[PDB]
Amino acid sequence: SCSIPQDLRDEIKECYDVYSVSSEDRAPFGPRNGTAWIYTSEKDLNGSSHWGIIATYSGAGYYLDLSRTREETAAQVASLKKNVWLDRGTRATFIDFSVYNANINLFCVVRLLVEFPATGGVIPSWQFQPLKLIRYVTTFDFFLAACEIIFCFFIFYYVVEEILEIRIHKLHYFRSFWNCLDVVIVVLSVVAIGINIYRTSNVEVLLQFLEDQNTFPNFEHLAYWQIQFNNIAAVTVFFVWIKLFKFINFNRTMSQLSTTMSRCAKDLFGFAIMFFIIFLAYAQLAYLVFGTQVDDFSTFQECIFTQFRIILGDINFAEIEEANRVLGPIYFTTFVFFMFFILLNMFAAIIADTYSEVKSDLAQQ
Amino acid sequence: RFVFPEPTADVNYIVMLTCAVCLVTYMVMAAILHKLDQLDASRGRRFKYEILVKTGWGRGSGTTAHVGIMLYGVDSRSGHRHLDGDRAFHRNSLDIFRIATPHSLGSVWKIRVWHDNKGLSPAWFLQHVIVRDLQTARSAFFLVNDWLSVETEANGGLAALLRFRRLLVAELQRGFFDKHIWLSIWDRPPRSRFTRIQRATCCVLLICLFLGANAVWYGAVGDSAYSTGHVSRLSPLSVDTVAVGLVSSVVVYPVYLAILFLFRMSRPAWCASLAHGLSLLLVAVAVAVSGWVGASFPPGVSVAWLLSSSASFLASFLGWEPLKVLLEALYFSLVAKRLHPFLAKEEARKVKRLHGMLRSLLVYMLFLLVTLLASYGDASCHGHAYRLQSAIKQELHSRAFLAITRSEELWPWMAHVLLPYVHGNQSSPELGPPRLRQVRLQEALYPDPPGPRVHTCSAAGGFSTSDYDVGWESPHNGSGTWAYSAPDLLGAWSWGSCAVYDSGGYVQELGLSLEESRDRLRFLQLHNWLDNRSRAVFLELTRYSPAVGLHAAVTLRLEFPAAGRALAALSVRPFALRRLSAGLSLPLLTSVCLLLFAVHFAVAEARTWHREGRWRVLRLGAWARWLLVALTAATALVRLAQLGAADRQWTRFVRGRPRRFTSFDQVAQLSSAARGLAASLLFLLLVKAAQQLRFVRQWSVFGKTLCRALPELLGVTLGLVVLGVAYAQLAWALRLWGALRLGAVILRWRYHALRGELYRP
Ligand SMILES: *[C@@H]1O[C@H](CO)[C@@H](O)[C@H](O)[C@H]1NC(C)=O
Numbered sequence A: 001s002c003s004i005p006q007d008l009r010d011e012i013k014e015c016y017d018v019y020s021v022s023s024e025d026r027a028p029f030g031p032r033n034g035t036a037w038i039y040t041s042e043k044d045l046n047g048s049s050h051w052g053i054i055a056t057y058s059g060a061g062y063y064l065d066l067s068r069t070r071e072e073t074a075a076q077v078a079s080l081k082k083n084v085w086l087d088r089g090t091r092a093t094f095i096d097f098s099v100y101n102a103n104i105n106l107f108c109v110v111r112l113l114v115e116f117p118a119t120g121g122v123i124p125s126w127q128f129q130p131l132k133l134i135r136y137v138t139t140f141d142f143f144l145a146a147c148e149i150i151f152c153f154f155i156f157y158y159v160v161e162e163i164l165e166i167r168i169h170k171l172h173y174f175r176s177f178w179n180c181l182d183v184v185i186v187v188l189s190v191v192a193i194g195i196n197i198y199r200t201s202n203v204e205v206l207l208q209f210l211e212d213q214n215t216f217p218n219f220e221h222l223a224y225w226q227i228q229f230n231n232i233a234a235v236t237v238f239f240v241w242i243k244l245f246k247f248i249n250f251n252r253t254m255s256q257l258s259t260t261m262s263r264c265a266k267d268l269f270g271f272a273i274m275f276f277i278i279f280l281a282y283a284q285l286a287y288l289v290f291g292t293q294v295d296d297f298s299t300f301q302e303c304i305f306t307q308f309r310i311i312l313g314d315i316n317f318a319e320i321e322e323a324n325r326v327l328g329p330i331y332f333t334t335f336v337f338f339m340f341f342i343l344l345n346m347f348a349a350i351i352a353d354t355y356s357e358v359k360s361d362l363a364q365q
Numbered sequence B: 001r002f003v004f005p006e007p008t009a010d011v012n013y014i015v016m017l018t019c020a021v022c023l024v025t026y027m028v029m030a031a032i033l034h035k036l037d038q039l040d041a042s043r044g045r046r047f048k049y050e051i052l053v054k055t056g057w058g059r060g061s062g063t064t065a066h067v068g069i070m071l072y073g074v075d076s077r078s079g080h081r082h083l084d085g086d087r088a089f090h091r092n093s094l095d096i097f098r099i100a101t102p103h104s105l106g107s108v109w110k111i112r113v114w115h116d117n118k119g120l121s122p123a124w125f126l127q128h129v130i131v132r133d134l135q136t137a138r139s140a141f142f143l144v145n146d147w148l149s150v151e152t153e154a155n156g157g158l159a160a161l162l163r164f165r166r167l168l169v170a171e172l173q174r175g176f177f178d179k180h181i182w183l184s185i186w187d188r189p190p191r192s193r194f195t196r197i198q199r200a201t202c203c204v205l206l207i208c209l210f211l212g213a214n215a216v217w218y219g220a221v222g223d224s225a226y227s228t229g230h231v232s233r234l235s236p237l238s239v240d241t242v243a244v245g246l247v248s249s250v251v252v253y254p255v256y257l258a259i260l261f262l263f264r265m266s267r268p269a270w271c272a273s274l275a276h277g278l279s280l281l282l283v284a285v286a287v288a289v290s291g292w293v294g295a296s297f298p299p300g301v302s303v304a305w306l307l308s309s310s311a312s313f314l315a316s317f318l319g320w321e322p323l324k325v326l327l328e329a330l331y332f333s334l335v336a337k338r339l340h341p342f343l344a345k346e347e348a349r350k351v352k353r354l355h356g357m358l359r360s361l362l363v364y365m366l367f368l369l370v371t372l373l374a375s376y377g378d379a380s381c382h383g384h385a386y387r388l389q390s391a392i393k394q395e396l397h398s399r400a401f402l403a404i405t406r407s408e409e410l411w412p413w414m415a416h417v418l419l420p421y422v423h424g425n426q427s428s429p430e431l432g433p434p435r436l437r438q439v440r441l442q443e444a445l446y447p448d449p450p451g452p453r454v455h456t457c458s459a460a461g462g463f464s465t466s467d468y469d470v471g472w473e474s475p476h477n478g479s480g481t482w483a484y485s486a487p488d489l490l491g492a493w494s495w496g497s498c499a500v501y502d503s504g505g506y507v508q509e510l511g512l513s514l515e516e517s518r519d520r521l522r523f524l525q526l527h528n529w530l531d532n533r534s535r536a537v538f539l540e541l542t543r544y545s546p547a548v549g550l551h552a553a554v555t556l557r558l559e560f561p562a563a564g565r566a567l568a569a570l571s572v573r574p575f576a577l578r579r580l581s582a583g584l585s586l587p588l589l590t591s592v593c594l595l596l597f598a599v600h601f602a603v604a605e606a607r608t609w610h611r612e613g614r615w616r617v618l619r620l621g622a623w624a625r626w627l628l629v630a631l632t633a634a635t636a637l638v639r640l641a642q643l644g645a646a647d648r649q650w651t652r653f654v655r656g657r658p659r660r661f662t663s664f665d666q667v668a669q670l671s672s673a674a675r676g677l678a679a680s681l682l683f684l685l686l687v688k689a690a691q692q693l694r695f696v697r698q699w700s701v702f703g704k705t706l707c708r709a710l711p712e713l714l715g716v717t718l719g720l721v722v723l724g725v726a727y728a729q730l731a732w733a734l735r736l737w738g739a740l741r742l743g744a745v746i747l748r749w750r751y752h753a754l755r756g757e758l759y760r761p
């Protein structure tokens, strides 16, 4: 699948490239007995992508459904092991199943992934997800259904009473931060309602499995939309709670504590850009220098999070100098000095100064 | 003739980074040009001497007239304005001409005069403004002294039957630097309806159209003549490297010269906004297409595409705008036969400063692009390098090797894991047999009783340099069967725990096959090859990976501080063997361009050293710029050395591959150093990019409050460190100072002072 340099082609017999949809095998190999030696497409596997660690794998490949009792599943696994099924050309392996636990009403789908990078090695990953597909059983579920129809009514009211404040009232005034936020909540709630309707509008895979209980239950799709819906329903609550600041002005001492922030949010924004430019300047330098032999700087995001953890005084530099000695301790010392004693303070001083003047800007009045 | 590639989920950074600079560099100068043409909008409403234009010679002027004077010449052109006064050249009235005519030629021919009277014509004749000299004599003391008529025109140098031969010259001199839109952002004449803000729009339109057109012919058109891509070397060919840029530039203009029609002659009511929208759409779609088609470029074509795109720009600058200017001048000279083309010194200084800032930003953006391509130009074999480095340790039992204490555990170590890893069925390709070079130290050590490890390391002497036969010293016939194998000229200095070694030492080739490897191992095991003084062991072989295309230098070392126990250390350096004899790859292109930025930055320092003369030392500007030269030169000259070493080692290995070792390790060092330097120059450029944020009105205080408070901060830290030294002299201050929160108050005082100072203006 890749190109062998002609100079040493007498030694390199063959190569296997990294995983890619344009370089994925599609031909039978070994004994062509069953479905474990024949490429089955994604469309007739009812699969989907996964977005693993090394890359994003498709839903096709060579699969096999194990048996229902141990003494024959072990025989199938032994048969797979004997006729070599994991050659060097293999790049990913998935094992998945699901359980019910009928005491409470809560399914649980399990997927385990093993990745074989082209540079050798093994990278494991796991995912357990507690789905629930038979919701409407207990009276509490009826109560939850009532409370979510109520939520739909509330979001309808909030969207209509916010549209009413655009063309029937103030035209095109957004720079208030209390209407720019009131739109984010509505949009996120609409998205979360659409996702929830789409998720529970098709549970046909459960019906198909319940028809015949000797096949593989393909619950993989629901376990993804459940995560995608929890990721949205958890951010909406955060902004709803943040919206409470709109109403805390009940006395003459809560008003100046907010005026201070409202008047120092213009000066802090200017310094934030200057701070984060040098922050990224350190981050990229660390990524380029140490990002090959540490693993704390292996990727750019990890480099950023490592510096954020340096600010907390969490990480120990016991291994930084091992990757490089000229730039090993120098980087740490200069970073700490310049961003923990000269640049991290300006965020404090400014605020303090602002507060002072604000107090005067009231006391004189 | 087109193929939809959509190959895979790969990414190409050269195309993505080039297109991400030509857009930032435009969004940045947009504000500069807005701030610059606001001055022209508010102002559009002296080398020349004091013009003696006291018109005490004309009378009988019962009307109002206006006289325009064209200050022609080389790099100078202007006109006239309204005479703000109560007289305003009424009946038997006149005035003296003196206006803002800063665009004045030298002490050469500069004269062109017209006079239009609204209504009647006076029966008078005002000769001229015959100045002699006040500042630089940008005019001549002479006059015509002719009568004034309907649209009178007096022309001279220091009626016109054949206007063509002079109208051509006038139109050429006017439009030569006004229609050439590339260098026309700097020299727009006043009272024009083109406004300097869509001059920077058409320019970026041409840039992003050249990028798209060159990106189309590479990777999308590959069926016609198969002449594209691999068959043509990325090196300058002049058959498919300069021709592509020419063709792309030629075909682009019918989109450009049609959108200029919506900027000029647009007062044609709201065409300016529509043209701006069409631009801001075409630029975006061109960038998107360029990215989508370039995300599949092999590492060899993406460097010829850059050269083709650069050469396309050199065609729109040296013969395609000049011919447009000539054609337009010919048109205006052959059809319609047109016959027409304290508060003060503060604005001139501001305009000069803005022009200097504008011309000082393109160089910085080019430098940033070059230094970004020099470092992230191949930022895809970086995760693969980390994976290869990690996978060479977790399968070679790094933890087991690093934990051995007995000096004899080495033999089971190699007999257990090393041999099954080096030799196998098809288990992890090798590219060269290992080696076991050893240093004797000639000064046999006397050990210490066991227990805790004796501090770190001590009790060492010299090094052996002679030959010894089988077993040990007994040289009988010629040289010892265990020769010294003197160190190589280049490629050594491992710098051990507490010693510094070189490439010399008694070597062991270990054989080729597993069985003969065991034979050699046991032979030197029984004959006491490693039980003596025997400072080090220095096991190091190689590693190749063709799936990602990376090599790896592996080195395993044991040091014996005292006889009886050893300390282990291993190093796996993954690199990419890119060689100087491979053509004109990216690491050479962005290493000869960086060498030119280290010369333009050096001559620009000599031109100030000479001008300021002696005693320029002891200032930041004469030191902070010499560091930049000494860094750019090193970054350029280290990569070249690495490229040369690649050729030398690779050809030496290919010469004797079946039986040699060739110790690629040195490259794995240089190819790292060249990455350390190129990752710090970009750091300096990014720091400067933050320092240059002081040009916003309300944000300039941040730099000043940091610079003025710096001495007090250094004084405080010096006091703390000397206090710590005094405390330790009797025989942690970070927590103390971090709890004192001093720096905060020091910065707050200066911030308050500067805010108070800035509040009043
Ligand atoms: C893989 O291909 C190479 C070159 O064609 C050759 O070694 C052989 O055909 C294959 N090797 C296998 C299948 O082990």
Ligand SMILES: *[C@@H]1O[C@H](CO)[C@@H](O)[C@H](O)[C@H]1NC(C)=O
Pocket (backbone or CB within 6 Å): A031, A033, A083
């Ligand atoms: C293929 O045949 C049976 C199943 O059809 C299987 O058990 C057997 O091992 C295979 N034959 C081989 C590998 O020779």
Ligand SMILES: *[C@@H]1O[C@H](CO)[C@@H](O)[C@H](O)[C@H]1NC(C)=O
Pocket (backbone or CB within 6 Å): A044, A045, A046
């Ligand atoms: C995919 O779903 C269809 C729907 O009935 C089913 O018939 C088929 O067996 C599924 N694919 C696999 C591999 O089970």
